Amino acid sequence: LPKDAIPSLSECQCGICMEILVEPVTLPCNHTLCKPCFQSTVEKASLCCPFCRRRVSSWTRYHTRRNSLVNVELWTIIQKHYPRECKLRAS
Ligand SMILES: [Zn+2]
Ligand SMILES: [Zn+2]
């Protein structure tokens, strides 16, 4: 994704639930999913990436402790180009 370029809506949708990516969590494999999905599908379930099966339990501990699970740079980009979609999910 080029700089200041407009991302497709599709590139901004969580691949698990199809909703807009709210507070996206990018795993060390570089697959991304929304925090809600992360919290249900990974943090309290598999500790796998749901796309590729990468073990992620130690990764989770590390960033949990440091409040750095969220990919702040991608979150910023999603809020900028799809603000309305983000507020609708918050609601
Ligand atoms: Zn999701
Ligand atoms: Zn993965």
Contact 24, 34 (CB under 8 A): yes
- The sign of the torsion formed by the CA atoms of 56, 66, 87, 2 equals negative
C-alpha distances in Å from residue 3, one per residue of 6, 71, 77, 88, 90: 9, 17, 10, 26, 27
**Å from CA of 61 to ligand 1 middle:** 20
| 88: containing domain | 1-91
Method: X-ray
Contact 87, 79 (CB under 8 A): no
Which ligand has the minimum distance to the alpha carbon of residue 25?
1
**Å from CA of 46 to ligand 1 middle:** 15
Which tokens belong to 77? 């980009």
**Å from CA of 3 to ligand 1 middle:** 25
Which ligand has the minimum distance to the alpha carbon of residue 16?
1
> Which CATH number covers residue 14?
3.30.40.10
The number of folded domains in the chain is: 1
